[PDB]
Amino acid sequence: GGSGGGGSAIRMTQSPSSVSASVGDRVTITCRASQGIGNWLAWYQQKPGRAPKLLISTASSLQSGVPSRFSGGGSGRGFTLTISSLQLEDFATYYCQQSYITPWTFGQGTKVEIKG
Amino acid sequence: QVQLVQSGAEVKKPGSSVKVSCKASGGTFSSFAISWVRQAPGQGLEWMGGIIPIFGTANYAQKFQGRVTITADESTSTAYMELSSLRSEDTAVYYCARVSGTTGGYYYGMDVWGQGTLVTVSS
Amino acid sequence: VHRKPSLLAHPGRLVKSEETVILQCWSDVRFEHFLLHREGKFKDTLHLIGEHHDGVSKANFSIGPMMQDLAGTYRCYGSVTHSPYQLSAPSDPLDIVITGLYEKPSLSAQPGPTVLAGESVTLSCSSRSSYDMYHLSREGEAHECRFSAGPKVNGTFQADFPLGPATHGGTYRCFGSFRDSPYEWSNSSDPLLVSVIGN
Ligand SMILES: *[C@@H]1O[C@H](CO)[C@@H](O)[C@H](O)[C@H]1NC(C)=O
Ligand SMILES: *[C@@H]1O[C@H](CO)[C@@H](O)[C@H](O)[C@H]1NC(C)=O
């Protein structure tokens, strides 16, 4: 954790590692931090091949063109991302990033899959 | 309509050096603060470093400091990332993205991204 | 070649963790744009358009809830132009430090906290932590940095601050820092009030 060599890299532990669900479904993804990042978290979405896209900034602020079904909240060390109605275009891999201290770290990632 | 175009995919041998270009369009190059993020099979996403907005100097992560140099040219409106000593594990897709700014000196997120450049370290 | 914009900090260059400080650049020369550069863990350059009042242009930059990256040597540059940012001479460097990251040290006073006028007082700062350097603050702001001693026989790391002959009282505080993180300081030493009794 802390050893006097400054603040070690803020480690983000993201959960779950993978998910399979249906269409019109609700799913929640949790992201935990080693230290306290405040509201300075961001959630990104990456579909295969395509570059990752920002979905939610400032823990809860949604960028433009983001459906309201994508919703995220949290504070301090615990954070969540809740997709209310799962749709086919939503199926991808989602990450969380801390914007606090310079060692900017991403979560391992969560994979959302359609069963069909 | 700020968008970023990255250099074509390149394949090099171990010990070589690779330079990736990130083309900027849709705004003033000086205003943007561009960072490089690596996605490797086995490593979700890693922030290698980024350029400061106006003066073009660079911040580097400890793991990538010593082998990575991030530069930019205002006239070219293009950013560059150079990996000095290529290693087989460095094989990954390398993205460039503009990190947005907000009040208090904080940067909150990376709004714009590039298509990514794949380096493949093959013997 | 332009005159140096003057950069100051309100309330002070010492800022506690998770707290806010305001940095202002003022100059008799009128720049429409003001720029601020930080050297340290995170280098960043912040822009705010200048507000022109009286005959002096000014700009209030806000450093948000304090964190490690936002600490460093801040310099303010000015420009009358827009896109090319034809830049002014650098402001005199201002070092903003974060306080409260590490354990608190202890501040003593030899001969004593309350002393007669003229009697020279030498405040001392010690802690078991291996702080490489100790910093002293009078009335919320000072510039007296002295290196720590080697591991003392008592197991402490100590630095002696000679205040000299004391005529005016004051409340002094002490902070600890490491060489690897120079602009990152510790908690505040419990305040010590130098009291001068004069006849
Ligand atoms: C900057 O903030 C200080 C403190 O409130 C205030 O006195 C000063 O007028 C402000 N300057 C500007 C240009 O707003
Ligand atoms: C610093 O002091 C505060 C109380 O003002 C305390 O809560 C905190 O734990 C202290 N930090 C350290 C590192 O000792």
Numbering used by the authors:
A (entry chain L): -7 to 108
B (entry chain H): 1 to 123
C (entry chain K): 25 to 223
Any passages from the paper?
The killer immunoglobulin receptor (KIR) family, which recognizes HLA class Ⅰa, is another group of inhibitory receptors on NK cells. The KIR family consists of single-pass transmembrane receptors, including inhibitory receptors with long intracellular ITIM domains (designated as “L”) and activating receptors with short intracellular domains (designated as “S”). Among the inhibitory KIRs, KIR2DL1 recognizes the HLA-C2 group, while KIR2DL2 and KIR2DL3 recognize the HLA-C1 group17 classified based on polymorphisms at the 77th and 80th amino acids. To identify the epitope of KIR2DL2/3 agonist 61 and explain its selectivity, we performed X-ray crystal structure analyses of the KIR2DL2 complex with KIR2DL2/3 agonist 61 and Pan2D.
As a result of the phage display, we identified scFv 61, which specifically binds to inhibitory KIRs, demonstrating low binding affinity to activating KIR proteins in ELISA (data not shown). Flow cytometry using recombinant inhibitory KIR proteins confirmed that scFv 61 expressed on K562 cells selectively bound to inhibitory KIRs. The cytotoxicity assay revealed that scFv 61 exhibits agonistic activity against KIR2DL2/3, but not against KIR2DS1/2/4. Fab fragments and scFvs of each antibody were used for crystal structure determination. KIR2DL2/3 agonist 61 scFv formed similar interactions with KIR2DL2 compared to the Fab. Additionally, a hydrogen-deuterium exchange mass spectrometry (HDX-MS) experiment was performed using KIR2DL2/3 agonist 61 scFv and KIR2DL2. The KIR2DL2 fragments containing the epitope of KIR2DL2/3 agonist 61 were protected from heavy hydrogen exchange. Therefore, the identified epitope of KIR2DL2/3 agonist 61 shown in Fig. 4B is reliable and it covers different amino acids in activating/inhibitory KIRs compared with the epitope of lirilumab or Pan2D, suggesting its selectivity towards inhibitory KIRs. Meanwhile, some amino acid differences from KIR2DL2 to KIR2DS1/2/4 that could cause steric hindrance or loss of hydrogen bonds may impair the binding of KIR2DL2/3 agonist 61 to KIR2DS1/2/4.
